[PDB]
Ligand binder design. Structure first.
Ligand code: ADP
Ligand code: MG
Length: 237
């Protein structure tokens, strides 16, 4: 398929890595070959969340021109799921040229059905370089008006940049009695609501376990919502 999807947001801590990891496993479980990419250069967490904790070669090495991207592709314990991990040390962060993200990622298009890019939030250099490496964008936001409007702005930017905006995910819903309900959130976002991921301790547990909740705790509300999201993502093909 070769669909490159940028997982983005207007703010950090909204669930980008969580959505990237769970969606990857959900899609992989449906038989699709997935590459989870950690484009969050200053806060590499994706590989750890997928249980790959010891990679010697990372995207940072590739972006520094010190390694071929082929050598930064690792297996994960999940069927059909591979990862392009990021380094955590500052020296690696410094030497990774973010401007080379688009060319590096797109060169892998023919080897996967889905390439999900975990992006840092915002509109600064690293964020833009990562988001612009994708062809499609999945907006991730929380039930906060400020988070919604900020994420909306990112979507508009990406839309103008040429990316197909698939829609958005309303994550961490139910965390507070002040949360904006889905119907209203969609009315605000101006893009299709693809899934509501509830606030669920099971998701946090998966994060700490290094095994996405979608697989670690398959009967949790969070797991089931991600399975549905994966179904929706495939339909929008
Ligand atoms: N729906 C949810 N329910 C409970 N905890 C969640 C949910 N979504 C994310 N989290 C937790 O919130 C934290 C931030 O998520 P993360 O994906 O790392 O954010 P981001 O990549 O946007 O910075 C993580 O520790 C994660 O386990
Ligand atoms: Mg993250």
């Amino acid at each position: 398929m070769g669909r490159i999807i940028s997982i983005v947001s207007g703010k950090g801590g909204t669930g980008k890595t969580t959505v990237t990891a769970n969606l990857s496993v959900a899609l992989g479980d449906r038989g699709r070959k997935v590459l989870a990419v950690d484009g969050d250069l200053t806060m590499a967490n994706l590989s750890l969340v997928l249980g790959v904790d010891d990679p010697d070669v990372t995207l940072h090495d590739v972006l520094a021109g010190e390694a071929n991207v082929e050598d930064a592709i690792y297996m994960t314990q999940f069927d059909n799921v591979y990862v392009l991990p990021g380094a955590v040390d500052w020296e690696h962060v410094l030497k990774a040229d973010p401007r080379k993200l688009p060319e590096v990622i797109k060169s892998l298009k023919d080897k996967f059905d889905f390439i999900l890019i975990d992006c840092p939030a915002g509109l600064q250099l690293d964020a833009m370089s990562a988001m612009l490496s994708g062809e499609e964008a999945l907006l991730v936001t929380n039930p906060e008006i400020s988070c919604l409007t900020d994420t909306m702005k990112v979507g508009i930017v990406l839309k103008k940049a040429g990316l197909a905006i698939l829609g958005f995910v309303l994550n961490r819903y139910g965390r507070s009695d002040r949360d904006i309900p889905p119907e209203a959130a969609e009315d605000v976002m101006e893009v299709p609501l693809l899934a509501v991921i509830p606030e669920d301790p099971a998701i946090r547990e998966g994060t700490l376990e290094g095994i996405p909740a979608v697989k670690y705790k398959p009967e949790s509300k969070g797991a089931k919502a991600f399975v549905k999201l994966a179904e929706e993502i495939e339909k929008l093909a």
